[PDB]
Structure 1
C-alpha cells in the first residue's frame, strides 16, 4: 500500500449509527452479488491503485473515490444507515469512471455494462419494510 495512494474510503467507525434494512440486505444479496461476479467487475473490485497503473493524476481529478471492494466491506460490516447511502456509492464509482476516462475506452464500456445491470436491480429495490 503506497504512500502515494490516498487512504481508502472509511469502512469502520463506531460513532456512525448503523442499521440493517431489508433494502440494504437486497443491495448485498442481490445487487453486489450480481455485479461482483460479472466478467467486467475486476477493475472495480478494489480502489484504483494509481501508482501501479501509472496514473499520477488520478487522485488529482477524482476527489471522491469509490469502488466495489469498499462497498462490499461497507455492506458486510454494516456501515450504512440506509440504502440511499449505498446507491450513492455505486453511482459515485460509475461517475468516477466516466469523468476520468475517454468515452468508449474499454473501462467505460465495462462500467456501462455493470451500470445497466445495476439500474435493472435498483428498479426492483423492495419497498422498505
Structure 2
C-alpha cells in the first residue's frame, strides 16, 4: 500500500469555520457511527484485500479516517474542499467496483444520508 493521503500540511493554509465544525461534529460523526461505515473508516488495504490494480486505477484514494483527521487538523480551507473529499471517496468506490456489489450499496446508503445532512448545512 502507498502512504495514505496527507492529513496536515505546513504549506497548506489551515482554517476553521462554523460549516467545517458542523461537518465534523454533526456530519462526519453521524456517518462514522453508521452501520455501513466500516469499509470506509480507513484507507483501502489493497494488500489484505488482494487488489493490485486498486491503487493503479484509483489515483486519488480517500477514506473517512483521512477526512476526520483533516477536519480535526483544520486542513480544509472551506466546506466545499471537505465535501469534495467525501465525493472522491464515494466516486472511487463507484469507479472500481461493478454495480450491485455489496460495497456499492453501502456507499449509496452513506451518500444518501450524507446529502440529507449536508442539505441542512448552516450558512457561512
Report the TM-score range of the alignment, normalised by the length of the smaller protein.
over 0.9
Q: Would you identify which runs of 4 or more consecutive aligned residues in structure 1 move more than 6 Å? A: none
Q: SS of the counterpart of 2:122?
A: coil
1:64-83 CA deviation, whole Å, 9 max, x = no partner? Answer: 11000000000111111101
1:30-88 CA deviation, whole Å, 9 max, x = no partner? Answer: 10011000010000000001001000110111001100000000011111110111000
2:11 and 2:58 map into 1 onto residues whose CA distance is: 27
Question: Residue 36 of structure 1 is aligned with which of 32, 36, 50?
Answer: 32
2:42 and 2:2 map into 1 onto residues whose CA distance is: 13
CA positional deviation for 1:16: 1.1
CA positional deviation for 1:7: 1.1
Q: Which moved more, 1:9-18 or 1:27-36?
A: 9-18
Unaligned runs of 5+ in 1: none
CA positional deviation for 1:100: 0.3
1:26 and 1:41 map into 2 onto residues whose CA distance is: 19
Q: CA RMSD in A?
A: 0.7
TM-score, with structure 2 as normaliser: 0.97
TM-score, with structure 1 as normaliser: 0.94
CA positional deviation for 1:90: 0.2
CA positional deviation for 1:13: 1.1
Unaligned runs of 5+ in 2: none
Q: Which residue of 2 aligns with 1:24?
A: 20
CA positional deviation for 1:103: 0.7
2:51 and 2:9 map into 1 onto residues whose CA distance is: 30
